RNA sequence: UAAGGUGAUAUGAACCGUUAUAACCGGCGAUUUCCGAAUGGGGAAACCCAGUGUGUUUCGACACACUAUCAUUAACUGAAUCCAUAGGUUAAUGAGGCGAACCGGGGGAACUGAAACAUCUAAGUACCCCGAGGAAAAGAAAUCAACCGAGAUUCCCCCAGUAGCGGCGAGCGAACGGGGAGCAGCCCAGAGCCUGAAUCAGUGUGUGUGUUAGUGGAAGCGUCUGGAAAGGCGCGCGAUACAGGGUGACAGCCCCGUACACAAAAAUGCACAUGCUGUGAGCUCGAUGAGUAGGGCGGGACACGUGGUAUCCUGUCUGAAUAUGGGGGGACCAUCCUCCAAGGCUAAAUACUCCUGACUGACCGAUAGUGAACCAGUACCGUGAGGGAAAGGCGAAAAGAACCCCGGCGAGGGGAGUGAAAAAGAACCUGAAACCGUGUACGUACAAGCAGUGGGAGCACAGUGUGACUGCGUAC
């Protein structure tokens, strides 16, 4: 837990943590999500949802 | 083989232990004798290699009762 | 001079033959060990 | 379910005949396909005393890979892929990109 | 034309390595007097 | 399910099929020589010889069937012997054999350790045998605990390398208690009322679900290099599919697939629904497993080597009490706690993998990884048990070299040709080193020794090579 608290602290330092309020996609289609991050300007990303 | 026909006493094995406790293998053979028992039901004599413990089972339980426990077991007499 | 191997098929088949091996318990264990190995020829027979 | 069959005018997509069109002669077993007048080789055929004793440098056609050919559409003018639909209870080869039956 | 036969070794030594090495039976050197 | 096939080395030859039985794949069925448990007797496995039925017969015979032993049971007829047994025959059943490990039981080492060695250890191991199952065994308290309680067995983590045992040496090594996995209890020793009363089995339709063939799958083109594009540069599209593989180099979009959505004549696994059959409930009462427990002797098992030593097993000799009675609580006794031996069954958690399916790997990459990447338990070796190899790679595709020469109608070679490549030519990717040559430069035929090293001319090249003469110098 000290490691994960130290990685998440560093992800806001090198601005690689972006918090969204909702990330969802209507149809279960890869084409829409492929669009999902172009406007978000993402190519190599990890989505973490609750 | 040295088996009682009533009690089923095999030879068992164990040790000889000397006064210097040297273990060496031996066998405790049962006290077997062939003895002819008179049955008044069958009007005959019937011989059985029986142990001396088995001779005490026979007169305590009966010779008809012992043989009934052999035909229902699978021994031949 | 006279060497140790003097062949006779009759003395061969009575010593190491299939029926000689199948006669005893310890020869059927020989034939079990030679099927378990995968041997081409099981005995001396053919 | 083969996508490339006995008499189909096909086009070659790969390998020294890229662009050339011919007809399949026989589909072999191992994914190799003889196409008419396409994959020509030069066989130094040795004359044996019988059995075509003409022993020249025979020019036959070699087998090409079945994935290196595609069926020529000719109603679009291009190479085209194959699909399988069921029309009238029969499995039907049909072209891609216009969906029409072969 | 069925060529390039091998070097079939003797059927005595099962370790072809020493097949051409020593006979591996008796080593008789007899003159040793040390006292 | 199909437009191609007739397995492989392996070309043919003669054919079969083309959308409806050519082949292929599956389910079921038929056939299934001979040997081998081998079973009709024998035998040197793969052979020899029958017996008795039953046919059919050209009269020479020919087929098919039966004929093992054992166990259990039944039928008949049957000695000494009168009854009667033993025996004998004929049936029906069932068994045997093989199998990698796991499992239970019966037997049971030694090397080794102890720094020698005998008690002890190794170790109840290796092995041998017997038997079984998909698991087995154990299992429903004669159990523990400690005055509170727990509540069948099995397995795992602690307890704890503790308590102990021990030539108190080497070493051996628990329980109680606690956390978990999984958790079912039931029968007979017995007669009644009730009276298929749930059960637990087998068999059969029925449903749900797998397994055994399968089906559909989604999208890319120009261009430069190149022998060939899957690469580069350009510009698109699929994605619940960018797992993987193949294709002339590295492919999401060429192929096979994959994600996904589907499918079963027939035969089977599993559940369920069960109908029909077998066991057999519930209630009243009684009953409560004797040559046993215990003991003497000798052994063995318990961590526990007889020690003060419980407990268990039993070879031998004895021998109770029968619930108001009996066992245990680590010698023994008294209390008072707890249980009811001498009958039996019992799922899961557990162990294993000969074998099948996928799937994975900071696993191997041909002296490695299986002994075996390859016609490998083979060649070979041994009388035998047994031992036991070495041996992968042309190319993208045989296009595997027509033809011409030398030669012995050779072998090998030189062309010509194929091909990107033949210095890829089959003794074939790459082709190292040892080792063996040829050509060239220099040195060398009066010079003694670890052969180098320091100095060093001359010469030959375009700094390199060689190294005369010379100092020092006895490898690892």
Swiss-Prot record, chain E:
UniProt domain Beta/gamma crystallin 'Greek key': residue ranges: 1-24
Disulfide bonds: 5-9
Domain notes: Has a two-domain beta-structure, folded into four very similar Greek key motifs.
Protein task: Crystallins are the dominant structural components of the vertebrate eye lens.
Family: Belongs to the beta/gamma-crystallin family.
Protein's UniProt name: Gamma-crystallin B
Organism: Bos taurus
Residues of the full protein shown: 15 to 38 of 175
């Amino acid at each position: 837990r000290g490691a994960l608290k130290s990685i998440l602290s560093e992800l806001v330092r090198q601005d690689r943590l972006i918090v969204v309020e909702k990330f969802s996609v209507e149809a279960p289609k890869t084409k829409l999500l492929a669009q999902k991050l172009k406007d978000m300007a993402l190519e190599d990303v990890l989505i973490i949802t609750g | 083989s040295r088996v009682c026909q009533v009690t089923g006493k095999r030879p068992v094995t164990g040790n000889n232990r000397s006064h210097a406790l040297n273990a060496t293998k031996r066998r405790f053979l049962p006290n077997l004798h062939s003895h002819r028992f008179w049955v008044e039901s069958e009007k005959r004599f019937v011989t059985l290699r029986v142990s001396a413990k088995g001779m005490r089972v026979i007169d305590k339980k009966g010779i008809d009762t012992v043989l009934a426990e052999l035909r229902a077991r699978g021994e031949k007499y | 001079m006279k060497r140790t191997f003097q062949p006779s098929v009759l003395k061969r088949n009575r010593s190491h033959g299939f029926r000689a091996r199948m006669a005893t318990k310890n020869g059927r264990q020989v034939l079990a060990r030679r099927r378990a190995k995968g041997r081409a020829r099981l005995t001396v027979s053919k | 379910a083969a996508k490339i069959r006995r008499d189909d005018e096909v086009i070659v997509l790969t390998g020294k005949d890229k662009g050339k069109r011919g007809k399949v002669k026989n589909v072999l077993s191992s994914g190799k396909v003889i196409v008419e007048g396409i994959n020509l080789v030069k066989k130094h055929q040795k004359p044996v005393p019988a059995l075509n004793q003409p022993g020249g440098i025979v020019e036959k056609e070699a087998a090409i890979q079945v994935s290196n050919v595609a069926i020529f559409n000719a109603a679009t003018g291009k190479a085209d892929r194959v699909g399988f639909r069921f029309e009238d209870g029969k499995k039907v080869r049909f072209f891609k990109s216009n969906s029409e039956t072969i | 034309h069925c060529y390039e036969c091998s070097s079939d070794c003797p059927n005595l030594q099962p370790y072809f390595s020493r097949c051409f090495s020593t006979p591996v039976w008796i080593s008789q050197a007899q003159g040793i007097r040390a006292g």
